[PDB]
Structures are given as C-alpha cells and as structure tokens.
C-alpha cells in the first residue's frame, strides 16, 4: 500500500475588499503543511514570519526592495485590477431564490406544527429570512440550518418555525435578497 | 464584503499541483496543468474574462521548488492527515420523479487527495456525475464537491463513498428519499 509521508506547500494571495474598491488589503500567505509560516500583509508593508519556520523567508524577501515595492503596489495593480475585471460577473451576479413553504415531516409534538421555509438556488449568499405571525415578526421558535454554499455559485438554506396553529392565522416567510427590489413572501394559512 | 483568492499548492510525493481563483468561496477557475489551459467554473465566465494559463505553470514550478526547500528545512516533518466531514444533500427540495441533484460535500480535510464514488443500490454510478477541484479554507484545510444528477424514487438508496488517508476505512454517506 501507499504509506509514504506527505509534504504540502500552499501559496495564497487574498485580496480583501471593503466598499468595493474603496479599501483594499492584500494578504499573501505561505502554508507549509497546516502551518502558516510567513505572510505579507499590505497593512503592515513587509513580510512577517508567523512561525519560526518562516523566519528565513521573511528576512530574505524583506531584503528584496523590488519585491517589496511591487507587493505594496499590488493592492492597486493586482487587487483593484482584478476586481474591476471580474466585478461584472461576480460582485454583480444575481440569481433569485426559489422559495417554498410546507410543514416539516418531523412534527414531534402533537398540537404543534413546525413550518419549513425552503430558500434555494440563490446568489449571492447574503440573504435575510424572517418569519411573521399575523404581521408581527417571530423572535423565538425560529431555527435555521445555516447558509449552505453548494459550490456551483448557488446557495440554499432552511429556516424552520415552531408554531401552535390556530385556524385563521397567517404565518409568513419573508425573504430579502439582492436579486429582488422588494421582499419575497410565502404564506402558510393555518 | 468581498474576497478574491489566488490559491496554489504542490504536494509531494504525489506530485499534485493546483492553481485557482476564488471569489467569496466560489471558484472562478483553475488551470488544467496537463492541457495547460484555463478551466472556468461556469461556462459564461470564459466569455466575460480571460486568463493566461502559462502564469500558473510558472508559479507551480516555484511552489514545488519552495516545497522541497521547506520540507528539508523542517527536517522532513510530514503533514498530519485530517479526515473529511462528509455530507450529502439535494440542491432543491426533493419530490418524486422531479429531476434533482445530489451534492456530496467533502470538507475540512488535508492533504488534498481523495477518492470519491457514487453508489446507487450498492453499485457505482458514473452517468452525468461531475466534481470540483480542491478549494481553499481559512484554516488551510480543503473543501471539494461531487455531483450526481438523479430522478427521485422511493426505491433507490444512494451513497457518497469517500476514501482519505485520515479515515481508517471508506466512509459511506447514505442518502435516500425521505420526503
């Protein structure tokens, strides 16, 4: 069998954007196995060892003035540049969520009824899902499975609401997402 | 509010290498090291942008050279295997005879080498399946997705079978219509 020891090296250039291209930070990092050893943080301006392993590298790289000037300028030439190139099909990408409401198949607890608000196939990930009972928001009883990133530029999530239904009540699942100007709503008529 | 990542890695002794761009966690593209071409995650991206694959090939060579030096410098300290967390879900609420897709989430693992297979009633499925390359994580472990298009039925029982050095035995994640 194959029992040879493995040795991994990762190099990551993270461009962090705040308010579009208003505030940008470049974080260059090297990871040996699962240990980040050295990095260049544009907020710092030079390489810094994260662990003893990376000391030789931060020292050598910081002695290279040309490398340093280019890395410092990269926030512009690389980060803001790539943001401008991809912004149209990434930052501005929008896929409206498919929203449906139905009762869970679990329903433990007799004179009770847990509702399920399924929100799927959307993009971007930022989304707000709230439950309401007769026009007023539900604070307690609400439970979410969390935001699920599908890996195909699509997200899904389930937000449940425990209820003690009374004929005539209207339970609404409201979804606010960048894909729509006004909130999406689906009502459960009890 | 946004993060774009150019992520790279080289793994010995497997000779595995990867170069990819990430946007808020979703892959923009990766470079096919053998064909030496850009592989866009979504077809349309290739119509809105371009990339010089040669840049990835140059970097990967530096990454390996660096790995070799670092491996020696660490007195050949090997990576500690971290088994993946495996989950199987549909991309949309399942309903009988309505086309859907099973997603196998392989997460929080390292090193970036795994064997993933789909099972339909104990037998391996190949038709229409697809997968992603290894995606980066903040803790420096990896994520990966495998997909299986299918037609729901109350009879079939699926399994996402995952093998990884961190697992003592193959992990079979069961999935069956329960709606």
């Amino acid at each position: 069998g194959d029992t040879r020891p493995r040795f991994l090296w990762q190099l990551k250039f993270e461009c962090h954007f705040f308010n579009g291209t208003e505030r940008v930070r470049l974080l260059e990092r090297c990871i040996y196995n699962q240990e980040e050893s050295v990095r260049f943080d544009s907020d710092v301006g030079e390489y810094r060892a994260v662990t003893e392993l990376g000391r030789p590298d931060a020292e050598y790289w910081n002695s290279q003035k040309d490398l340093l000037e280019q890395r410092r300028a990269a926030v512009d030439t690389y980060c803001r540049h790539n943001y401008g190139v991809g912004e149209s099909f990434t930052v501005q990408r929008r896929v409206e969520p498919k929203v449906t409401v139905y009762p869970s198949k679990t329903q433990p607890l007799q004179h009770h009824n847990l509702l399920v608000c399924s929100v799927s196939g959307f993009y971007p990930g930022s989304i707000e899902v709230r439950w309401f009972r007769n026009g007023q928001e539900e604070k307690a009883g609400v439970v979410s499975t969390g935001l699920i990133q599908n890996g195909d530029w699509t997200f899904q999530t389930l937000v449940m609401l425990e209820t003690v239904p009374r004929s005539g009540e209207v339970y609404t699942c409201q979804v606010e997402h960048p894909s729509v100007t006004s909130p999406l709503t689906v009502e459960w008529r009890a | 509010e946004h993060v774009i990542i150019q992520a790279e890695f080289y793994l010995n002794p497997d000779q595995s290498g990867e170069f990819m761009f990430d946007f808020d966690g979703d892959e923009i593209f990766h470079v096919d090291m053998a064909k030496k071409e850009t592989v866009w995650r979504l077809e349309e991206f290739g119509r809105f942008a371009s990339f010089e694959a040669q840049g990835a090939l140059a970097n990967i060579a530096v990454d390996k050279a660096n790995l070799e030096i670092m491996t020696k410098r660490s007195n050949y300290t090997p990576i500690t295997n971290v088994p993946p967390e495996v989950t199987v879900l549909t991309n949309s609420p399942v309903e009988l005879r309505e086309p859907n897709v099973l997603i196998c989430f392989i997460d929080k693992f390292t090193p970036p080498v795994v064997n993933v297979t789909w099972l339909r009633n104990g037998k391996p499925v190949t038709t229409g399946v697809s997968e992603t390359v290894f995606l980066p994580r903040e803790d420096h472990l990896f994520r990966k997705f495998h997909y299986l298009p299918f037609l729901p039925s109350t009879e079939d029982v699926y399994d996402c079978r995952v093998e990884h050095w961190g697992l003592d035995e193959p992990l079979l994640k069961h999935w069956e219509f329960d709606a």
């Binding site: 250039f13 590298d57 | 942008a49 840049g55």
Partner: peptide, 15 residues
C-alpha cells in the same frame, strides 16, 4: 474578456 492578472510566486532563500 478582460485579463485576470496573476501575482508571481516568490522564491524562498536557497539551501
């Protein structure tokens, strides 16, 4: 489309 740019990998100090 518009070209996505690459940042080049820095070589670690030699043995």
């Amino acid at each position: 489309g518009e070209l996505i740019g690459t940042l080049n990998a820095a070589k670690v100090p030699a043995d």
